[PDB]
């Protein structure tokens, strides 16, 4: 019963291992194993539940263990292991074959098979940790191992894609440990974690690997947002070390999502508005990306309110996420209607929900935007309006208070009007007829560059699938 | 089933008179003794709540509002099982004998079609479309398919269900598209625009109503002048004032329609006053419009306040085109508004980009914003011009 269970999953694990084993030996095929490793994460997660944990026990016995002797015992000690044929050397799948990692040449140390075996061994260990949700000592014990090993081992172009997915598990398992319980040893692990990301990023710069460097950047930018220090992130994004070539579909929208949050407190909404829009188009529409689309669309609606312009409220309805978008509808309604008491009572009840996404701090500053939008609505209606007519509609304090607030709207060129103190009315200075200026040419010059930018993208992509088929023989 | 649908429709919202719901309730109890209206009244309490929903004797035990006259007494309660035996036990046994004796084909199909009309008055909709499906396989020509599309259309008319009914209305024309005569070809497109009025697609669905109601009426459910109020209000609503002179004010059917009854007050009082550019007498005609037309009519009250926001901005927009600058004493001191009350109407229209107007708060000189040679060639070109790269890079940047 239990004997046939261990041989079934181990044969499928070697079958998938031999596919990427022979491809990395000749030249560089690494593009092909990268596609296989994408599905390997999903196929292994479903397979870990079946046949219990015994699929990874005989896999270490098959190959040679450089560091992994005590790692499997320590990983299986917390679950109160039940020992069945636990003596090492029970299952031998090698039997002296070239693709089987021939033993005599391996035991005599005349050849080194540890490079591809050990780096792949750490991948299967991190998968069971996230599947079984093993925390506390098991998280810190594996961190003391992989990091010193990556410093001694020098990865080639194909080998840099192995640990690229391991850095995500180190940061993911660390954040779940801090939020679960607060202990004195929690931040001691984060200090070394923050210093380790900067040391390995220095080496990956010369490797020119797209997935390796881009995976760390999105993990480093998230750490800066938790501490709330832009000075570390400001110079970090100015170097432009983020590879734009191949992020696949995972890192497309993750990079632009951080720039929208950083520039939100920079008081520049021109560039931040484009980053949040590009994050929506680059993010997949599937169910696994719904967690990202939930937080991203909530940030886009908050940026528009900070710009002074009322966005489209139809997104709060036709979308299927409106259950979580209900608190944000009353915020825009209070800013549009200009009611002072409605905005104060709206943020009071939903303050608990705004604490999770940390958007309540931006909602406090929406108190000013209620007046910013209210002035824009009343100004467009009446070109010449009396000074006391504004205080009657918005129920303001006095005439000296509104005189200061209207002067704040034309600061950046929003309203573009003038205040006449002696005449007693505010007159709009916008005569339209802007076509006589150079403004139409300013937009058309970018459309030509944007059209040729899409041309330059299509300019050079054809031959990539044609390299394999034209070089190989065809019927 | 239009009598119980149109008269009892006042059970939704009536702010005018109390006897309006009382007088209309007499027709509900009068027509229910012949054919069973029970599934209609059960849905009235399940649609709108905390108004008339407490008038039903047995749904949940409640008593509220002004209406004790709508209910099922101990008579109709005993008649509930009497109508079920006649509409199910009596009819199904007669049709079952037809399948055993094998008499005719289309005659057996018309039996299930006629029987399917009773399920609309039963209130079980699973067997309503099932019996129509049995006659669907027996239907050969288009003669038997006429009553099929009518019974399916009643499912959304009788039960006020615009969700599952519109799928069956479109499934008949999509599977086999013929249409026969142009009369039925407009019928498949008419039922398409009916369920679109519930979601309020505005001029898309409403443009077909003025064409169909001015030519032919089904005459089985209602009369020609009873539902003519739907096209009278939506006639000037959807159509611009430029084409009202060659269509509405001069029409063979409409000009003869106003002489039938005085309950329209749209194609005559509102059309002539709007074409004459006189808003002094035009506005008081709107006082009897919403009360005596929009409220009693079904599909018109589905909009109600949705009419004015489009109409109130249009009536002043046509006046702004006839003068470069107007005067406040004409708007404030004469026709439709006072001085201070003017801020509520045009105040919310301009920030919505519905119209461009300027009002003076000192001298009282109204100013009109004219685009002149700009129009859509310069300003509006920039707005809709950005959609070129927006829709192209939306799904284009992700390749496949």
């Amino acid at each position: 019963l239990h004997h046939s269970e261990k041989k079934y999953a181990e044969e499928d694990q070697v079958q998938e291992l031999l596919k990427v084993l022979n491809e990395i030996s000749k030249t560089t095929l690494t593009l092909d194993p990268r596609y296989i490793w994408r599905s390997l994460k999903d196929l292994s997660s479903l397979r870990n539940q079946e046949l219990l944990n015994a699929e990874t026990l005989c896999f270490t016995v098959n190959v040679l263990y450089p560091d992994s002797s005590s790692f499997k015992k320590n990983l299986l000690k917390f679950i109160t292991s039940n020992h069945k044929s636990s003596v090492p050397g029970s299952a031998e799948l090698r039997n002296s074959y070239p693709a089987s990692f021939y033993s005599v040449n391996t035991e005599k140390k005349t050849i080194e098979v540890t490079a591809e075996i050990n780096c792949f061994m750490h991948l299967l260990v991190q998968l069971f940790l996230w599947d079984s949700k093993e925390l506390e000592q098991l998280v810190e014990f594996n961190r003391k191992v992989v990091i010193p090993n990556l410093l001694c081992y020098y990865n080639l172009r194909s080998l840099n894609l192995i640990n690229a997915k391991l850095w995500f598990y180190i940061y993911l398992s660390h954040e779940t440990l801090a939020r679960s319980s607060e202990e004195i040893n929690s931040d001691n692990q984060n200090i070394i974690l923050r210093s380790t990301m900067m040391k390995f990023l220095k080496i990956a710069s010369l490797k020119h690997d797209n997935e390796t460097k881009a995976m760390l950047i999105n993990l480093i930018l998230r750490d800066f947002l938790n501490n709330g220090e832009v000075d570390s992130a400001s110079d970090f994004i100015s170097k432009l070390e983020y590879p734009h070539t191949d992020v696949s579909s995972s890192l497309e929208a993750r990079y632009f999502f951080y720039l929208s949050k950083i520039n939100a407190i920079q008081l520049d909404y021109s560039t931040a508005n484009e980053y949040i829009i590009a994050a929506i188009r680059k993010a997949p529409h599937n169910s696994k990306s719904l967690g990202f689309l939930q937080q991203s669309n909530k940030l886009h609606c908050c940026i528009q309110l900070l710009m002074g312009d009322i966005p489209e409220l139809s997104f709060f309805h036709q979308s299927n996420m409106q259950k979580s978008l209900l608190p944000y509808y009353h915020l825009t309604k209070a800013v549009k209607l200009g009611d002072l008491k409605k905005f104060t009572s709206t943020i009071t009840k939903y303050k608990q929900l705004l604490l999770k996404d940390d958007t309540y701090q931006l909602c406090v500053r929406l108190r000013s935007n209620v007046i910013k939008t209210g002035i824009r609505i009343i100004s467009l209606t009446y070109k010449k309006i009396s000074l006391r007519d504004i205080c009657l509609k918005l129920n303001l304090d006095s005439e000296q208070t509104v005189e200061y607030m209207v002067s704040r709207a034309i600061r950046d060129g929003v309203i573009e009007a003038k205040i006449n103190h002696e005449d007693g009315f505010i007159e709009t200075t916008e005569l339209l007829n802007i076509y006589d200026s150079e403004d139409p040419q300013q937009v058309f010059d970018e459309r030509i560059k944007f059209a040729n930018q899409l041309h330059d993208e299509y300019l050079v992509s054809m031959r990539y699938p044609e390299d394999k088929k034209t070089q190989q023989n065809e019927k | 089933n239009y009598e119980v649908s149109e008269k009892a429709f006042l059970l939704t919202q009536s702010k005018v008179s109390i006897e309006q719901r009382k007088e209309a309730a007499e027709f509900v109890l009068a027509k229910i003794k012949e054919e069973e209206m029970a599934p209609y009244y059960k849905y009235l309490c399940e649609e709108y709540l905390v108004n008339n929903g407490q008038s039903d004797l047995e749904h949940d035990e409640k008593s509220d509002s002004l209406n004790e006259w709508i209910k099922f007494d101990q008579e109709l309660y005993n008649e509930l099982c009497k109508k079920n035996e006649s509409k199910i036990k009596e009819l199904n046994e007669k049709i079952q004998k037809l399948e055993e004796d094998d008499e005719g084909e289309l005659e057996q199909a018309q039996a299930w079609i006629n029987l399917g009309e009773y399920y609309a008055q039963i209130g079980d909709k699973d067997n309503a479309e099932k019996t129509l499906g049995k006659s669907l396989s027996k239907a050969i020509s288009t003669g038997a398919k006429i009553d099929v599309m009518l019974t399916i259309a009643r499912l959304g008319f009788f039960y006020n269900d615009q969700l599952y009914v519109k799928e069956k209305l479109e499934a008949v024309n999509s599977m086999i598209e013929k249409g026969g005569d142009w009369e039925r070809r407009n019928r498949y497109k008419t039922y398409y625009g009916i369920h679109c009025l519930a979601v309020r697609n505005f001029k898309e669905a409403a443009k077909l109503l003025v064409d169909s109601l001015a030519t032919f009426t089904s005459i089985e459910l209602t009369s020609y002048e009873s539902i003519a109020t739907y096209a009278s209000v939506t006639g000037l609503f959807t159509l611009e004032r430029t084409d009202l002179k060659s269509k509405v004010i001069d029409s063979p059917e409409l000009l003869s329609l106003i002489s039938t009854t005085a309950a329209l007050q749209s194609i005559s009082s509102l059309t002539i006053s709007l074409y004459a550019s006189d808003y002094a007498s035009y506005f008081p005609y709107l006082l009897e419009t919403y009360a005596n037309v929009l409220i009693p009519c079904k599909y018109l009250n589905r909009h109600a306040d949705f009419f004015v926001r489009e109409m109130r901005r249009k009536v002043y927009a046509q006046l702004l085109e006839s003068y470069k600058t107007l005067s406040l004493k004409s708007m404030a001191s004469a026709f439709g508004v006072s001085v201070a009350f003017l801020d509520n109407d045009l105040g919310k229209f301009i920030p919505n980009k519905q119209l461009n107007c300027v009002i003076d708060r000192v001298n009282g000189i109204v100013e009109t914003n004219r685009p002149d040679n700009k129009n859509a060639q310069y300003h509006l070109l920039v707005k809709q011009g950005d959609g070129l790269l927006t829709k192209l890079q939306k799904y284009g940047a992700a390749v496949r």
């Binding site: 489209e312 409220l313 139809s314 309805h317 036709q318 | 702010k15 979601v199 309020r200 697609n201 505005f202 506005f283 008081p284 709107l286 006082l287 919403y290 009360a291 929009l294 109600a304 306040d305 949705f306 009419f307 004015v308 926001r309 109130r312 439709g336 508004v337 006072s338 009350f341 109407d345």
Partner: peptide, 27 residues
């Protein structure tokens, strides 16, 4: 489509038409 749905309140007809009755009496 749905933006026009919620933004329309209970105002206008039932309200403004009641004001037009007393407006003509004051003139």
């Amino acid at each position: 489509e749905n933006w026009d749905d919620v933004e329309v309140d209970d105002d206008f007809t039932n309200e403004l038409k009641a004001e037009l009755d007393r407006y003509k009496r004051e003139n």
